């Protein structure tokens, strides 16, 4: 029981009952979200996609976090060219818990 699906430009493989961190979504922190673009579903038997996004497979998740990642410092430094540049980054992350998997 594990499903592979494309959510935010990258494909995630998740098993039932776990949580996944992905790109930010326009969904409330306490809202249910649906993923019908399920690229693959696997169980004791194997079902594969002849066409992307299966036919009826769907993943239901519940949003838990709408946070920001750990601080990453970008520093550019040019040797003997008199240049140092500093920048900070905290990529937004959405953490969800996969509550349901269809067939």
């Amino acid at each position: 029981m594990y499903a592979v699906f494309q959510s935010g430009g990258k494909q995630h493989r998740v098993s039932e009952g776990q949580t996944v961190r992905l790109e930010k979504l326009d969904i409330a922190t306490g809202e249910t979200v649906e993923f019908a673009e399920v690229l693959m579903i696997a169980n004791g038997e194997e079902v594969k996609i002849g066409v992307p996004f299966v036919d009826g497979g769907v993943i239901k998740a519940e949003v838990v976090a709408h946070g920001r990642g750990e601080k990453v410092k970008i520093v550019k430094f040019r040797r003997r060219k008199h240049y140092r540049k500093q920048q900070g980054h905290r990529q937004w992350f959405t953490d969800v818990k996969i509550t349901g998997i269809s067939a």
């Binding site: 592979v4 494309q6 990258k10 494909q11 493989r13 690229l39 693959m40 696997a42 194997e46 594969k48 996609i49 002849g50 066409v51 992307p52 410092k73 970008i74 520093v75 550019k76 430094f77 140092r84």
Partner: protein, 117 residues
Amino acid sequence: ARVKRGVIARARHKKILKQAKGYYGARSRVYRVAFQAVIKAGQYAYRDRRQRKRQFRQLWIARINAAARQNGISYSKFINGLKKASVEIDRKILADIAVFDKVAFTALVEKAKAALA
């Protein structure tokens, strides 16, 4: 009017020392030497950020090629069969499936061979 810079110097030196924290020898104690380490460490981090993409890409390439040759087919043939069968699973997921579920990878290689033939 005197403007003493002791507090500002202390703050900046402490920040640089914290950034350099964890290094070996004087690189973690001397500000004049630690400061250079922080900049070089950040440059290495910036380069390795890009390097991570290629490293993981080639790792997945190696994993999938190894699995395919274990089942008796080249990686290029495997990818061509997947494309012909319209399989959009990426290299990372292919490698992960090969590692975890051997039956899923067996089905993948079977479909790739069927598409090729």
